[PDB]
Design a protein. Structure first.
Lengths: 97, 93, 105, 79, 11, 16, 90, 103, 78, 97, 16, 11
DNA sequence: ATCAGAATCCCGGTGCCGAGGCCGCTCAATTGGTCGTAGACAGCTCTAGCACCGCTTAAACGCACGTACGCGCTGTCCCCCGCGTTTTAACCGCCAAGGGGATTACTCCCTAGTCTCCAGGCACGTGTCAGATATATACATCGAT
DNA sequence: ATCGATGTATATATCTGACACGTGCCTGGAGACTAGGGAGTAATCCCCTTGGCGGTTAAAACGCGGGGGACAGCGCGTACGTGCGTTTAAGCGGTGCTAGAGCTGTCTACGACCAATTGAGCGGCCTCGGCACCGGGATTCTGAT
């Protein structure tokens, strides 16, 4: 049969998900997560749909930027696979803890 | 029950720069928010400048200095030129 | 033409900027020239970003500015990118780039 | 219980957009923790803003203001 | 640069 | 491009 | 400047402990900076809700927005205690 | 006085005057300066107590900027609050990466 | 004139930073970074002193310029 | 008679992390600041406190940058900081494109 | 627990 | 923690 | 390696729904006039920044050695990618309803503004002790034996 | 393991200038008072958020095989750290000068404020073409040979 070499599918995946602009996380699970997280700060809260959409936009943009930085970190160590240590280094350098 | 925006003015500017290009509603909202953000930045810097020098009025000089502080480099130079020309033209009339 | 914008030869509402400055209590008083300068600066910045957005839209064979085009225009200019360094554009995506070492031999 | 809603393929897609070619197996839990921390930080400020106005529904402007508090603006959710 | 030549050329 | 705009702005004001 | 008040607080918490002039300037700058941050946040909050009066509620919410958890909780407790004490007496 | 009426040491009147002159809003409430002064007093007391402990640990009876820097950086919460701030002649926290240490 | 930031000075700064070994090419990079940072801060401070129509760069101007870039500085008569 | 390499470096690290005075000679730094400011409005003048504040800020910035650089170098399983480490730290911090 | 201090302040400031 | 024991102890 | 198989783009035909244009009106920007105050401007004064000289030294600089470290090369083996099946839950559409945001009308109480006055705070002057410095001393470290 | 050679904390003595305090003055905060509008409350209307239900189907979970890259190990060159001898200019003390920061007094140009006015922009409505979508064929593009 036919089978691509390990890695080439990932390249086209990068190209596709960099060309497009839609959200990557499923809306309903993210909304449920946001609702639960906010539930402890104050009970019986309600959310405008636009509020949840804005939360998802901000979270996805932040995660994408963090992944760019941690990819730079991993490459700097003569590696290709990103590991948790790269994420921790990127966050530590960014100042956030 | 009356919202205000820069949608009309942004549309005129676009039609003047690109005579045949349209703009989506989401892009229009984004441009509106961008204009508001830049206005807030410049006005806040001008207010801080006025309060720093014990003044009490925001003049053209303060706004120009705030622009020079905020905008990076060539953008700042061109914006300063544009504002100076606009003020000279306005005072001439 | 009653409008101060017509006097200044601008396309932005000089009167509205003056009212916003007076209402936002940035200072006790507001000079007459300040709204003109601020409106001119805002108009120039809007024109500058919109020109690049239109160029990007034309490159994409479209004729309607969409947030993707605005994001491309902003990120493809060092000056604007520096200005909007901390800004996140909704539905803007990211600039297409790939680190060289990831590419195959 | 609900943090698992951010499934592994979703994190993989986010990393792919970020420009990552290979992913270690332990990345997913760290990413979930990071996202949870970020969401707590933003949502706490949003809920505080809402509570100040004596409202019971978080609106988009509250999220925008919380993001501005965290030194991270966001365009396209009302001026 | 080219922006200054382009900014002046508006009409 | 400027004098014409200034004259038009200063023309119709009192005539209204 | 806040030199006198910082001095009284220091003698209240640490009876026998001086403070250098440079450290006093440090503390004065810190007090000014925190006051400016809190006042700016309260002004932003008031302008948000179309309000036109900074009250104790606005400053309390600004404190809850600026300081970290335990610090914010203790600061809010102290502020509420002081406000109730000042209101009860006159 | 107002400051003494609230059981505070910080100047309530001066804070009220600063709030008024700083054009933060059109009007300023009555309890707002009291609340602000109480918060400022609490923060000052916290940082001063930590700095005094640090100075005592250094066998000195006089607060210096080094003590303030030590107190700020050694407390995680104050460090988070005082994140993007530099203290003149404050020095740095004494640390060394464990790998750099010899065998 | 930038070469006035001597090699041992950069070495001392790195030592305070907790750096054990130092590559030879580090010094030029550090000089460039310091020049860029000083250029930005000094440009902002000079603009501030321009607006006041003064001819002397006061310390408060430097403090304002630092605060512009999110670097608050304490202990300069603020 | 002859300390093995790395010992005097550790002693210097312990010493300079304990003290608080500035590490760059005042006069060369002042000359550098004046020469940089010469590009902008000429015939400028500086208060001594202004130059002092500039020096303090520069020292703090450089120390923080070197700390992040050391973290980067350690991440690559090294002990010697290299220019690529400074570039990576600055790029992640956001000071560079 | 400084009600006495508050009363004195209400008196001392009023004594002036 | 120790801050709560310290915050209450003011006088 | 050239060729087979799998994305990928690019052509053309349709449907539609969101962008673009028109209209009434209404409320917000203009035009006219004033009035008092912020700010421009001339003048003096005195602080402080700049310029220069001598001279010590402490730091910088240049050089030699060698050793620890960066870096290239290999083996390996295990972890991660690609892919095919099966399961699952997002989601899209539709329906109900009730909490709660948004407006509007009234009351009043809380805060701005004024006058008076006096005490807290600030500049100034002064004494002395915490701290800086020097020196001999004892102790912790460390590197070759 | 160890001990001589270095570096460092320790204890004691001395000197000093920055801090802690006392004093006189003054101006800003407090007390008393009035006026008015910001907002707190209630009452109402209707958008819009939540909740449920059901069929689709695309996506997630899962298992499996294998290639590649992470990592440990080894060797080799070389480039920094250490120490020493020579140079130099930072720093300190001192002097002298003058520019401009800062304060004071004067005047007036201008922005807040108010009133009558009208048209610029906004909400609502209607229409069509830009674009999304569907579908097939040419086009690259990749991997085994």
């Amino acid at each position: 049969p036919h089978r691509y070499r390990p890695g080439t599918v990932a390249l086209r995946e990068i190209r596709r998900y960099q060309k497009s602009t839609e959200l990557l996380i499923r809306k309903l699970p993210f909304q449920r997560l946001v609702r639960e997280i906010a539930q402890d700060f104050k009970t019986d809260l309600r959310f405008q749909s636009s509020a949840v959409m804005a939360l998802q936009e901000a979270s996805e943009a932040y995660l994408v930027a963090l992944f760019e930085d941690t990819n730079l970190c991993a490459i700097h160590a003569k590696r290709v696979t990103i590991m948790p240590k790269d994420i921790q280094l990127a966050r530590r350098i960014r100042g956030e803890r | 029950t009356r919202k205000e925006s820069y949608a009309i003015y942004v549309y005129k500017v676009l039609k003047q720069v690109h005579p045949d290009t349209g703009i989506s509603s989401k892009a229009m909202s984004i441009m509106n928010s961008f204009v508001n953000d830049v206005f807030e930045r410049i006005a806040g810097e001008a207010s801080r400048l006025a309060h720093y020098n014990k003044r009490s009025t925001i003049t053209s000089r303060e706004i120009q200095t705030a622009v020079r502080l905020l905008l990076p480099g060539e953008l700042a130079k061109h914006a300063v030129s544009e504002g100076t020309k606009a003020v000279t033209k306005y005072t001439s009339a | 033409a009653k409008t101060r914008s017509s006097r200044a030869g601008l396309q932005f509402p000089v009167g509205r900027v003056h009212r916003l400055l007076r209402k936002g209590n940035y200072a006790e008083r507001v000079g007459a020239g300040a709204p003109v300068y601020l409106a001119a600066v805002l108009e120039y910045l809007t024109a500058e970003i919109l020109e690049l957005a239109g160029n990007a839209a034309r490159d994409n064979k479209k004729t309607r500015i969409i947030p993707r085009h605005l994001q491309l225009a902003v990120r493809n200019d060092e000056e604007l990118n520096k200005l909007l360094g901390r800004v996140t554009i909704a539905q803007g995506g990211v600039l297409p780039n790939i680190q060289s070492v990831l590419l195959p031999k | 219980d609900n943090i698992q809603g951010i499934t592994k393929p979703a994190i993989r897609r986010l990393a792919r957009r970020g420009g990552v070619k290979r992913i270690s197996g332990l990345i997913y839990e760290e990413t979930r923790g990071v996202l949870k921390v970020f969401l707590e930080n933003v949502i706490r400020d949003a809920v505080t803003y809402t509570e100040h106005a004596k409202r019971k529904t978080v609106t988009a402007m509250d999220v925008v203001y919380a993001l501005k508090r965290q030194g991270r603006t966001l365009y396209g959710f009302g001026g | 640069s080219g922006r200054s030549v382009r900014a002046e050329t508006r009409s | 491009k400027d004098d014409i705009k200034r004259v038009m702005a200063a023309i119709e004001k009192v005539r209204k």
